[PDB]
From a paper:
The GagΔMAT8I construct lacks most of the globular domain of MA (residues 15 to 100) and p6. The GagΔMAT8I protein, however, was not soluble when released from bacteria owing to its self-assembly into spherical particles inside the bacterial cells. We, therefore, purified GagΔMAT8I assemblies directly from lysed bacterial cells. Upon iterative refinement, the final density maps of the Gag hexamer from GagΔMAT8I assemblies in the absence and presence of IP6 and GagT8I VLPs were obtained at 4.2 Å, 4.2 Å and 4.5 Å resolution, respectively. The SP1 helix in the GagΔMAT8I map is complete and extends to the SP1 and NC interface, therefore allowing model building of the C-terminal portion of SP1, from T8I to M14. Intriguingly, we observed a strong density above the six-helix bundle. This density is coordinated by two lysine rings formed by residues K158 and K227 (K290 and K359 in Gag amino acid numbering) near the bottom of the CACTD and above the bundle. Considering that GagΔMAT8I assemblies were produced in E. coli cells, it seems unlikely that the density in GagΔMAT8I map is IP6 (left). When the same GagΔMAT8I assembly is incubated with a buffer containing 10 μM IP6, this internal density is present at lower position resembling that seen in GagT8I VLPs. It is plausible that a small anionic molecule other than IP6 assists in the charge neutralization of the lysine rings and promoted assembly in E. coli-expressed GagΔMAT8I. Radial density profiles from three different particles of similar size displayed three distinct peaks corresponding to the CANTD, CACTD and NC-RNA density layers. While CANTD, CACTD and SP1 are rigidly connected as seen in the GagΔMAT8I map, NC-RNA is flexibly linked to SP1, resulting in a smeared density in GagΔMAT8I subtomogram averages.
Residue numbers in the entry:
A (entry chain I), B (entry chain D), C (entry chain E), D (entry chain O), E (entry chain J): 146 to 378
């Protein structure tokens, strides 16, 4: 088996870092000579980022289907002993036991089912590294035509998944949320001093995008125009 | 035994949160009916914060000494079977095996050594909650008379332990480090636009605190005084 | 065993590069299927950087303690043959021989003690990669209030460990040492032309920081002030 | 054996990326426990970049020679069975069969010839990573004194090896080729609007470097001089 | 045999220092009483500087030929025992084994083949010390009529072999490359501030040496002449 601190360190590295091309080294290093059951154990222990786990699990099942497609199940009628060759269904450890897993790995010849599963998972992780883009708290920005309340609601929504301590989150919430708004709601949210709370702020920019507010802004632009349309009249 | 995802979730909660008075509930909940060996396993799996682990381990050994002090070791000469009562040395699982641990917990009467160890660890964690103060990246501030280079060196030194992703750290390094300096080095670091790197910044404030710089500042103050010492002359 | 050129190439890569997250790949690649004794051999062959070797050796001994804590030593009374299971003390190859090491690795089942030691060392190297910061000759800068002689003494002190050829070191000594001084000693060291030696330079800035020199500088600042304090009188 | 999709993914990574220090991880990961024949198979499947393949093949043969130099061929007269030890000639799989390869890898003790070949290939790939410099389409620039026609001929010559789709290549051919010419031919190629084809362009700059053209340019420079040599006369 | 740290220290001294007349002492000291096979082992472990290794290997083979020329191979028909005298072919350890090497060195009289090989290698190293000139990064200078791009290409080409750490190389690349150019390209590369990258620099001096640029420079010289050719007209 594998020691719990190894699994914790590996998962620490997976949370701690964004998708990057160097995950495979650390994975192959820590997951050394393990058994397939333990590898799937190591797989489902990842927390969050289930989006990519979708594609990963999919490339696994696809390789499983292809190994099935290459290998025939013809066997018998030998009396039960070393009962079949492995199957793309069980190489991933879905329908087989640790006992059966050992009876594969210590028997001669040692068919390295674990190694094959490792190879597949590496292929998958590579494809993932190519097909992902890490999301942060830093990128979340207000759309140009977007109700401010929904903006804050998405802000907190993704913020709750951010991996940091408490006080970081507080100061984060204080600096970026206001800083990253559109110019339209910023030029009103920032006139009101940075002492009010999210409630007063919400009630402040609640008018943006509406007809009364668009009127106001258009009138201010037109008045600034005509002020000099008439300096010379 | 305990399932690996339980240990990962508990440790996730311990890293993710600062010392707070509510850790004990979650700990007692997850660490339910476990065996002492597993509890110590759950203990040493914590990563970082070894400072408090010092005091924790100490309160454990102190309770162990006191349980020793209360319980006598007189026993025998019964032939080997259920060989002794437990000991403050082994209740913490230092000199006993999982086998011996079971031979304690399933035998009648079930002396709940695990429960006692749980009680001690709870006492300890409580004392820790009282005697700690969480450190952040947010608190690190420049001393009033402090070489700026050492300031940045401590900044990064504690920054490397911060528990967050990559791009957070980058923007962190860009905003707080400059913002949190003393007024003396700030009024020179901030005159130079926020486009230069840490090297140019370092070479800029390298003069602060020195005699040539103290001269400069004193002369500017005195000149501003005398400018009006003489407006009226 | 391992061939000497492999060890030389690996150590070449370790000296040649600063701490970086990609050391583990090359290490696991070169240190392939080796025996634990050879791995420790590969460990102590590193030259310099003993600071991190402290922490590395420590994480090894800690994993060793934990493997001890998990595995019981109960065994016997079988007559001597395959005499015990390995121990966290000897898995690192402290109290065991190459003979005993082989008698572990070629026997059935092959308990891959070497692989386990590899796993531990990888864990350690990773933790090192996180907890280090490479020092260079390039960073060494004069403190703001620092006797120039001690500055040069530290310069050479760390310079002697720099990994380069002779003439590089010479030109290094000529350009950075003077360039990286504080403005106070620079404005005197650089008035004296770049033809004098370290001795004349030392005798030149020997006055900085002292009361006579602070007087001089303060008087020059005050005189420049009063020159225009009186242009208008 | 190895599955074809693994080989395709590995070769995809090798084409897709320039020489970089992280190829070894992915290589060792995918090429796991394989047989030497398969490793050489994986070697010659690389497409293009044969230049470095020269040096790679050379470091392999050199290690082979050295292993020969260390290991004696004395053996016999045992009747044929496990017939010799391997040889630096056949460890690389030149003069041995897959059958003989298996008769090495499954026999006791399993002499890991494949692992040794892996070690050599890793050494080689590392040396390659050090001794290469990736060429692009982006670097190709006109020499200062260079017939424009040869410039375009080299442009296309290396362009045909670029690894991209069709329309990319078209727009590439339209923007960089003209942009990257020398000022001399650019100041004539760019006066003619960007609507003419490569033929008209070729006929345009065909005069550069020649005596008639050098005359023209020298006369224009001299005339611009004398225009003000005489403003004041 | 020889201990690996001895070989590493010797090779450290060989890389670390340029060709100098004092290598022989350290070599003879470390390579003490060794066996010829180990000496050749110590020879091919040198990394880089293969140029001189050519001449070295050549003087070895020449001494080997001469020892052949002096010593006759007549021997026999004694039954196999201490089978021949050594040969200039095998004294260098090309066609002999460590076993045969021992059967030479421990037999009476001990023909010190290793000592003779040592003598030859010393002769060779001496001749090398005379016939070499160390190349540095420091000497690389731009030819007077040389396309700047090729200049940078050679700069990096030899730079990649320099034996130093990362940040040294960076600052090296920043200071010497620009400093060491010809006056012609320097007076344009240095007018553009030291903030642009190698790409902008390349595009800047791409015009040098060409007819348009030679025109420009000649016109500026002639105009400066005529400015005073006419002050007095």
């Amino acid at each position: 088996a594998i020691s719990p601190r190894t699994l914790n360190a590996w998962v620490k590295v997976v949370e701690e870092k964004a998708f990057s091309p160097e995950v495979i080294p650390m994975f192959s290093a820590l997951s050394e000579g393990a058994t397939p059951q333990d590898l799937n154990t190591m797989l489902n222990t990842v927390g969050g980022h289930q989006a990519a786990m979708q594609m990963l699990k999919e490339t696994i099942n696809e390789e499983a289907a292809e190994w099935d497609r290459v290998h025939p199940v013809h066997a018998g009628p030998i009396a039960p002993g070393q009962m079949r060759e492995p199957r793309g269904s069980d190489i991933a450890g879905t329908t087989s036991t640790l006992q059966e897993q050992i009876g594969w790995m210590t028997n001669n010849p040692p068919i390295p089912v674990g190694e094959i599963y490792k190879r597949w998972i590496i292929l998958g992780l590579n494809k993932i590294v190519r097909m992902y883009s890490p999301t942060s708290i830093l990128d979340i920005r207000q759309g140009p035509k977007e109700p401010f309340r929904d903006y804050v609601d998405r802000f907190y929504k993704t913020l709750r998944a951010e991996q940091a301590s408490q006080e970081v989150k507080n100061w984060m919430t204080e600096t970026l949320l206001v800083q990253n708004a559109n110019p339209d709601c910023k030029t009103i949210l920032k006139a009101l001093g940075p002492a009010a709370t999210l409630e007063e702020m919400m009630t402040a920019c609640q008018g943006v995008g509406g007809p009364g507010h668009k009127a106001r802004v258009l009138a201010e632009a037109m008045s600034q125009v005509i002020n000099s349309a008439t300096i010379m009249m």
